[PDB]
Paper text:
In Takifugu rubripes, one of the first vertebrates whose whole genome was completely sequenced, a protein sequence bearing the EPN motif and a hydrophobic groove was found (XP_029706534.1). Altogether, trMincle shares similar characteristics with mammalian Mincle in its amino acid sequence and its FcRγ-dependent cell surface expression.
As trMincle was predicted to be a type II transmembrane protein, we constructed the extracellular domain of trMincle as a soluble recombinant protein followed by column-based purification. A calcium ion was coordinated with Glu-Pro-Asn (EPN) and Trp-Asn-Asp (WND), two well-conserved motifs, suggesting the typical sugar-binding pocket observed in other mammalian C-type lectins was also present in trMincle. Furthermore, one glycerol molecule in the media interacted with the EPN motif within the hydrophilic pocket, and hydroxyl groups at C1 and 2 of glycerol formed coordination bonds with calcium ion, which is similar to the reported sugar-binding mode of mammalian Mincle.Fig. 2 trMincle is structurally similar to boMincle. Indeed, overall, both fish and mammalian Mincle possessed hydrophilic pockets and adjacent grooves;, although the amino acid residues were not identical. Moreover, the molecular dynamics simulation suggested that the trMincle CRD can create a typical groove similar to a mammalian Mincle. The crystal structure of trMincle suggests the formation of a stable homodimer.
Residue numbers in the entry:
A (entry chain E): 47 to 180
B (entry chain A): 45 to 180
Write the structure that this text describes.
């Protein structure tokens, strides 16, 4: 907890044993992830309903750390764990209009909230997560 | 350690920054009813005490009521804990009693060219941020 002060000074904040960072620029999924990795973190991994509610309450469209396995329409978190519990928004994931949508955003729009597969080269604000406590 | 203090608030969606727990509402409300919610939860509207805390507030990219209110019509300001305003982060041209109307309550405004505090009519609605200072 004394260890958290330099993170707070950089604008990270603490929820349920992880530190989180919300970007102030948008970027592609891969470059977003590169920022998080450079900070010793990764894109956010949603492990519980409470964490999804925390994510949603920022009212912000955000890249998160979930990516398709090639074109198989199966999904894996950035730490290598397989997708189990999911929070896809209505009608997602869908490879919209036949385009390859391999990366996952939390979408925040009126009538439409939750995860969406999106073209990875599109840009979004992004959320990093770093596990601190065991 | 500190988790016995924190986990019941994490369980309600609060989150921890510096010595405080913070709550972002999921409904909009008037400044006074926003405050009433924070008070009911054992907290108050957010009080900005440092540049780092202002940067934290601003990075949520969200217009939010905060715990700063005018003293009557005197154009002086006091935080909800009774402390006088010292360091400030007003957006450009604020506070201004816009168009002659009484703007006694303070929001953090998030718009494309303009960020920072704004005085606004208290009866208008915004999302709000509560703060509960939990650690000494
Ligand atoms: Ca997580
Ligand atoms: Ca999609
Ligand atoms: Ca404060
Ligand atoms: Ca104003």
């Amino acid at each position: 907890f004394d260890k958290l002060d330099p993170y707070f000074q950089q604008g990270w904040f603490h929820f349920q044993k992880s530190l989180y960072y919300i970007s102030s620029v948008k970027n592609t999924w891969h470059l977003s992830r590169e920022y998080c990795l450079q900070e010793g973190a990764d894109l956010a991994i949603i492990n519980s309903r409470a964490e999804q509610a925390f994510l949603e309450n920022f009212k912000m469209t955000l890249w998160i750390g979930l990516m398709e396995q090639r074109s198989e329409r199966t999904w894996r978190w950035v730490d290598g764990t397989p997708l189990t519990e999911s929070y896809w928004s209505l009608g997602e994931p869908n490879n919209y209009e036949g385009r390859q949508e391999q990366c996952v955003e939390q979408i925040d729009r009126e009538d439409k909230k939750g995860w969406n597969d999106l073209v990875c080269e599109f840009s979004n604000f992004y959320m990093c997560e770093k596990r601190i406590f065991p």
